[PDB]
């Protein structure tokens, strides 16, 4: 039951003036592509607060990556779903290395101890298995957001992202034609996508959705990875290749612009990006 | 469980070329606004067929309005959800006057006999009550679409419209500022909207959604109309005023452009409309 909004005073949307004329703001399957200027966060905040929405955020910090948690969490506190209920799930082989970061009201952190794998490829790839865990998220949160830890928030990341299923435009490929995408190209892999298929190249470092849709996606990608293993093939970009195959065949209901996953050292600050919200740490 | 799409070959969406630059294609609460050029119907058709989607279409044909049914249904057959399962629900005081129109496969028509009210205002207004009926739609269709009968389809009206809750931009007001909207302005009415509120002016002749959301909307508008009656006030534009109050406070998840409800005699064929899909019959 969606509760009625209260009276609100805000600028009228005008149908004969687009917000943004410089970028695609809706996919061909009618999913919004989230850019600054496309959303009124006051409206969205109302809608999601009236539902008492809880967002879970998953992050893996294995081996030396535990060093990135302090900045990741400190800046999450400043920028990520502020005002909403948040549950951080920190998966680590080193529980005692998790920094004690002061949280705002309505926000909590759980440390989930996991095995470290030796190869950084397996650490990255096994996130899907670990995320898929399963009864816990279903009882505790409405949405799950799944990110890389070697990152910092610099600007607003809020309920505008929430939807049944989302992926994020990889910042190196948003302007590329599809044959340039680094999809897995060997037919022997479950992640295979031919040169004439593909909508976008999604980044493995930022995806999410409802708990149900996230469990579906992580289960399907883990199954597909196990099939590849049994067959002696490792996809070119590991979990990210499978994520891309999944999202090709199960279209996301929102797509995040590269505002939401950017690398300023590698790519600068183009005029098309009005905000750099979540960025790579050198 | 959303089933996997098959391989498909279609044009790549390019994030640095918008489809449409001339019109707003997404609302500030991240609802798509459906214009020609924003959707790939082949993708949407796949998505909805894999769900075996059934669409119900409600139409009232009371008193002399039964004359409009032949053209309405004949042209629906040519343009409305072709290839999908369709159930037409024709509400009439004259069952024997319903024309025998030949339907495509997978499509059916039921005639629901109702009382005629004397005043065209009450005939229009009581649609909400009649639509809200209730167990029947829940068992028989996935979505309900609710339209005026004095209309004809001229072009494609398909699954691009389907969503939990939609309204349609009134063709006389899409370019107007909000204080020009003919919302009910008396505070004594449940339909009241102040001059500094409002996103759009939605047309009472074309709305829809999931069966659940449509039942919510029609129930809320009927309750609000009964309150107004008890209080001796009739809103300026009857059901349409209440519809507008509802959609202000419960935002639609898609908005249809005026392609979907147009009057060529009154308003011509502006360049912003690439297609005139469902049009007023003189
Ligand atoms: O030794 C490792 C390697 C990977 N990761 C996790 O896997 C993510 C993906 O790896 P990485 O950020 O190195 O990949 P990149 O962004 O360079 O593609 C990291 O953010 C961590 O969250 C980890 O915790 N420890
Ligand atoms: O005597 C009447 C008056 C109204 N209607 C139904 O109510 C709708 C709304 O009325 P109308 O189309 O006259 O309103 P308008 O489009 O002129 O605002 C009509 O399409 C019919 O579906 C009807 O069936 N018989
Ligand atoms: O081509 C795909 C790759 O692009 C790189 O820029 C990124 O650092 C990698 O993790 C991978 O996503
Ligand atoms: O101002 C609202 C009105 O606009 C007219 O153009 C239309 O014929 C009416 O039914 C009503 O919608
Ligand atoms: Mn990373
Ligand atoms: Mn009409």
Ordered DSSP codes for B214-225:
HHHHHHHHHHHH
Element housing B280 (H / E): strand B278-280
Residues of B in contact with A194 (CB under 8 A): 7
**CB of A169 within 8 Å of any CB in chain B?**
yes
A contact residues 121-140, partner B, Cβ 8 Å cutoff: none
**CB of A102 within 8 Å of any CB in chain B?**
no
A253 and A167 Cβ atoms separated by less than 8 Å: no
Angle (nearest 5°) at CA B58 between B223 and B120: 60
Per-domain residue ranges for chain B? Answer: 1-282
Q: How far is CA A147 from CA A101, A128, A144, in A?
A: 18, 12, 10
Beta carbons of B18 and A22 less than 8 Å apart: yes
**CB of A27 within 8 Å of any CB in chain B?**
yes
A171 and A267 Cβ atoms separated by less than 8 Å: yes
Q: Could you tell me the sign of the dihedral formed by the alpha carbons of A223, A228, A232, A234, in that order?
A: negative
CA–CA min distance B121, chain A (Å) = 27
Q: At what angle do helices A211-230 and A238-249 cross, to 10 degrees?
A: 120
Beta carbons of B38 and A30 less than 8 Å apart: yes
In the reported structure, the alpha carbon of residue A33 is separated from the centroid of ligand 3 by a whole-number distance in angstroms of: 21
C-alpha–C-alpha distance, residues B87 and B106, integer Å: 9
C-alpha–C-alpha distance, residues B36 and A31, integer Å: 15
Closest C-alpha to ligand 1, atom 3: A120
| Ligand 4 and B94: CB distance under 6 A | no
Q: What are phi and psi of A33, to 5 degrees?
A: -110, 120
Resolution (A): 1.5
State whether residue B194 is helix, strand or coil. coil
**CB of B177 within 8 Å of any CB in chain A?**
yes
C-alpha–C-alpha distance, residues B94 and B63, integer Å: 7
**CB of B47 within 8 Å of any CB in chain A?**
yes
Beta carbons of B30 and A32 less than 8 Å apart: yes
Beta carbons of B16 and A272 less than 8 Å apart: yes
C-alpha–C-alpha distance, residues B43 and B69, integer Å: 32
What is the arrangement of strands in the sheet containing A254-256, beginning at the earlier edge strand? A33-34, A254-256, A165-168, A206-210, A143-147, A54-61, A85-92, A107-113
Beta bridge partners of A63: none
Closest C-alpha to ligand 3, atom 4: A172
Q: Could you tell me the sign of the dihedral formed by the alpha carbons of A154, A160, A164, A169, in that order?
A: negative
C-alpha dihedral (A75, A40, A35, A138), degrees to nearest 10: 60
Which residue, among A145, A195, A207, A216, has the nearest Cα to A170 in the 3D structure? A207
A176 and A100 Cβ atoms separated by less than 8 Å: no
In the reported structure, the alpha carbon of residue B199 is separated from the centroid of ligand 4 by a whole-number distance in angstroms of: 17
Q: Give the burial class of B119: count Cβ atoms within 10 A of its Cβ; 0-12 exposed, 13-18 middle, 19 or more buried.
A: exposed
Q: Of the residues A63, A65, A131, which should be mutated to test ligand 1's pocket, given the most ligand atoms within 8 Å of the CB?
A: A65
Element housing B245 (H / E): helix B238-249
C-alpha–C-alpha distance, residues B87 and B110, integer Å: 7
Q: Could you tell me which residues come within 8 angstroms of residue A42 by beta carbon, excluding any fewer than 6 positions away?
A: A8, A10
- CA-nearest residue to B37 within chain A is A28
Q: Could you tell me which residues come within 8 angstroms of residue B39 by beta carbon, excluding any fewer than 6 positions away?
A: A28, A29, A30, B160
C-alpha–C-alpha distance, residues A194 and B11, integer Å: 14
- State the best of A4, A6, A12 to mutate against chain B, taking most chain B CBs within 10 Å: A12
What is the arrangement of strands in the sheet containing B54-61, beginning at the earlier edge strand? B33-34, B254-256, B165-168, B206-210, B143-147, B54-61, B85-92, B107-113
Q: At what angle do helices B211-230 and B238-249 cross, to 10 degrees?
A: 120
C-alpha–C-alpha distance, residues B189 and B234, integer Å: 8
- CA-nearest residue to B176 within chain A is A14
Which residue, among B37, B1, B41, B34, has the nearest Cα to B21 in the 3D structure? B37
Nearest ligand to residue A60 Cα: 1
C-alpha–C-alpha distance, residues B103 and B81, integer Å: 12
B contact residues 191-220, partner A, Cβ 8 Å cutoff: 194, 196-200, 216
How many CB atoms neighbour CB A196 within 10 A? 12
Nearest ligand to residue B148 Cα: 2
C-alpha–C-alpha distance, residues B90 and B66, integer Å: 10
Q: Give the burial class of B164: count Cβ atoms within 10 A of its Cβ; 0-12 exposed, 13-18 middle, 19 or more buried.
A: middle
Query: What is the DSSP annotation of B23-71?
Result: S--B-TTS-BEE-TTS--HHHHHHHHHHTT-EEEEEEEE-GGGGGGHHH
State whether residue B278 is helix, strand or coil. strand
CA–CA min distance A282, chain B (Å) = 27
Would you give the DSSP letter of residue B259?
A: G
**In chain A, what is the straight-line distance between the N-terminal and C-terminal CA atoms, in Å?**
45
C-alpha–C-alpha distance, residues A32 and B30, integer Å: 6
Residues of B in contact with A197 (CB under 8 A): 7-9
Angle (nearest 5°) at CA A95 between A92 and A101: 100
CATH superfamily of the A1-282 domain? Spore Coat Polysaccharide Biosynthesis Protein SpsA; Chain A (3.90.550.10)
Q: How far is CA B48 from CA B5, B159, B248, in A?
A: 10, 7, 28
C-alpha–C-alpha distance, residues B14 and A201, integer Å: 11
Would you give the DSSP letter of residue B86?
A: E
Integer-rounded Cα Rg, in Å, for chain A is 19
Q: Could you tell me the sign of the dihedral formed by the alpha carbons of B21, B22, B26, B32, in that order?
A: negative
CA–CA min distance A175, chain B (Å) = 6
**Residue A182 labelled as part of a binding site:** yes
Beta carbons of A13 and B7 less than 8 Å apart: no
Of B160, B213, B240, B259, catalytic:
B240
CA–CA min distance B236, chain A (Å) = 21
For strand B143-147 and strand B54-61, is the pairing parallel, antiparallel, or unpaired? Answer: parallel
In the reported structure, the alpha carbon of residue B150 is separated from the centroid of ligand 2 by a whole-number distance in angstroms of: 7
Integer-rounded Cα Rg, in Å, for chain B is 19
B281 and B69 Cβ atoms separated by less than 8 Å: no
Of B15, B17, B249, the CB nearest to A5: B249
| Ligand 2 and B166: CB distance under 6 A | no
C-alpha–C-alpha distance, residues B257 and B21, integer Å: 15
Q: How far is CA B228 from CA A220, A236, B192, B202, B242, in A?
A: 53, 65, 11, 20, 10
| Ligand 3 and A237: CB distance under 6 A | yes
Write b or e for each residue in A32-41: b if 16 or more Cβ atoms lie within 10 A of its Cβ, otherwise e.
Answer: bbbbbebbbe
**In chain B, what is the straight-line distance between the N-terminal and C-terminal CA atoms, in Å?**
45
C-alpha dihedral (B62, B66, B71, B77), degrees to nearest 10: 60
C-alpha–C-alpha distance, residues B282 and B279, integer Å: 9
Longest CA pairwise span in chain A (Å): 60
State whether residue B206 is helix, strand or coil. strand
**Phi-psi region at A54: left, alpha or beta (left = phi > 0; alpha = psi -120 to 50):** beta
Q: Could you tell me which residues come within 8 angstroms of residue A240 by beta carbon, excluding any fewer than 6 positions away?
A: A202, A203, A204
CA–CA min distance B243, chain A (Å) = 14
State whether residue B105 is helix, strand or coil. coil
State whether residue B249 is helix, strand or coil. helix
The secondary structure of chain A, three-state, reads: CCCCCCCCCCCCCCCCCCCCCCCCCECCCCCEEECCCCCCHHHHHHHHHHCCCEEEEEEEECHHHHHHHHHHHHHHHHHECCCCEEEEEEEECCHHHCCCCCCCCCEEEEEEECCCCCCHHHHHHCHHHHHCCHHHHHHHCCEEEEECCCEEECCCECHHHCCCEEEEECCCCCCCCHHHCCCCCCCCCCCCCCCCCCCCCECCCEEEEEHHHHHHHHHHHHHHHHHHHHCCCCCCCHHHHHHHHHHHHCCCCEEECHHHCECHHHHCCCCCCCCCCEEECC
The secondary structure of B113-169, three-state, reads: ECCCCCCHHHHHHCHHHHHCCHHHHHHHCCEEEEECCCEEECCCECHHHCCCEEEEE
C-alpha–C-alpha distance, residues A89 and A110, integer Å: 5
Nearest ligand to residue A121 Cα: 1
| Ligand 2 and B61: CB distance under 6 A | yes
B282 and B202 Cβ atoms separated by less than 8 Å: no
Question: Residue A189 half-sphere exposure, CB side, CA atoms within 13 Å?
Answer: 22
C-alpha–C-alpha distance, residues B179 and A134, integer Å: 50
A1 and B187 Cβ atoms separated by less than 8 Å: no
């Amino acid at each position: 039951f969606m509760v009625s909004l209260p009276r609100m005073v805000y600028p009228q949307p005008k149908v004969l003036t687009p917000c943004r004329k410089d970028v695609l703001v809706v996919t061909p399957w009618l999913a919004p592509i989230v850019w600054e200027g496309t959303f009124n966060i006051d409206i969205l905040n109302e809608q999601f607060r009236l539902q008492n929405t809880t967002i879970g955020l998953t992050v893996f910090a294995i081996k030396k990556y535990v060093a990135f948690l302090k900045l990741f969490l400190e800046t999450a506190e400043k920028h990520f779903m502020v005002g909403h209920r948040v549950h951080y799930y920190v998966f680590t082989d080193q529980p005692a290395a998790v920094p004690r970061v002061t949280l705002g009201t309505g926000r909590q952190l759980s440390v989930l101890e996991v095995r470290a794998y030796k190869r950084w490829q397996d650490v990255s790839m096994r996130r899907m298995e670990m995320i898929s865990c399963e009864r816990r998220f279903l009882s505790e949160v409405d949405y799950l957001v799944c990110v890389d830890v070697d990152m910092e928030f610099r600007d607003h990341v809020g309920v505008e992202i929430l939807t049944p299923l989302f992926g994020t435009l990889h910042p190196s490929f948003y302007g590329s034609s599809r044959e340039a995408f680094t999809y897995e190209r060997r037919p022997q892999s479950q992640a295979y996508i031919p040169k004439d298929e593909g909508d976008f190249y999604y980044m493995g470092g930022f995806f999410g959705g409802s708990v149900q849709e996230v469990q579906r996606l992580t289960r399907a990608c883990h199954q597909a990875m196990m099939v590849d293993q049994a067959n002696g093939i490792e996809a070119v970009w590991h979990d990210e290749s499978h994520l891309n195959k999944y999202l090709l065949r199960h279209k996301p209901t929102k797509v995040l612009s590269p505002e939401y996953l950017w690398d300023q050292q590698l790519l600068g600050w183009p005029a098309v990006l009005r905000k750099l919200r979540f960025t790579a740490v050198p």
